[PDB]
Amino acid sequence: GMNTVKNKQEILEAFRESPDMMAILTIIRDLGLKDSWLAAGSVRNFIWNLLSDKSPFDHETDIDVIFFDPDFSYEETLLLEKKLREDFPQYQWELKNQVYMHQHSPHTASYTSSRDAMSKYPERCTAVGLRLNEELDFELYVPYGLEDILNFQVRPTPHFLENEDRMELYQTRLSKKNWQEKWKNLIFKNT
């Protein structure tokens, strides 16, 4: 049955059909963090595997949970990360405050919001979001279009090619990624 997916609708139905993919969402909702949501590879995992006859629902891959809280302490960010993983070892909560993201990258001044931080990820297919809203829907964000994910493309954003130092961060962080190694139809690009 559920397999013949080429579009958002057919993917989003499968997300909610999974208890575990839902669970990870319902928890980050109640977390009371500001400006956070599930974005990048976490959300992508249930979408790429879906189209590759893999396990979209394994819950045993990394869980990108960015946020923006300039009022929350640098250290408390790392403290809260351990609390996520202690209380719930079964998931791989990656808690990263994007405020302090000036030191771990080249020319990356502070973002306006989580969606802006998204359009400034190392790849276009990475610049994507999924969470619930006030109606308990699927909020989606695809700043480059859905097709980058459906065709399994790995290209940099235009925000990267503008600055050679940002390209050097991408290229270095390409080779050690087991992309094509997990997915036998994963396209690589530089543009």
Q: Which amino acid is at 149?
A: I
Are the CB atoms for 93 and 85 separated by under 8 Å? Answer: yes
Residues 6+ apart with CB under 8 A from 117: 66, 68, 98, 101, 111
- Experiment used for this model: NMR
Nearest-angstrom CA–CA distance, 130 and 65: 11
End-to-end CA distance of the chain: 36
Instruction: Identify which of 143, 71, 78 has the alpha carbon closest to the alpha carbon of residue 104.
Output: 78
Two structure tokens written together for 98 = 């994007």
**One-letter-per-residue 3-state SS of the chain:** CCCCCCCHHHHHHHHHHCHHHHHHHHHHHHCCCCCCEEECHHHHHHHHHHHCCCCCCCCCCEEEEEECCCCCCHHHHHHHHHHHHHHCCCCEEEEEECCCCCCCCCCCCCCCCHHHHHCCCCCCCCCCEEECCCCCCCEEECCCCCHHHHCCEECCCHHHHCCHHHHHHHHHHHHCCCHHHHCCCCEECCC
Instruction: Identify which of 94, 140, 96, 141 has the alpha carbon closest to the alpha carbon of residue 118.
Output: 141
Residue 77, number of CB atoms within 10 A of its CB: 16
Residues 6+ apart with CB under 8 A from 127: 40, 118, 119, 120, 121, 142, 143, 144, 157
Strands 92-97 and 153-154: unpaired
Nearest-angstrom CA–CA distance, 113 and 80: 21
Buried b (16+ CB within 10 A) or exposed e, 98-134: bbebeeeeeebeebeebeebbebbbbbbbbbbbbbee
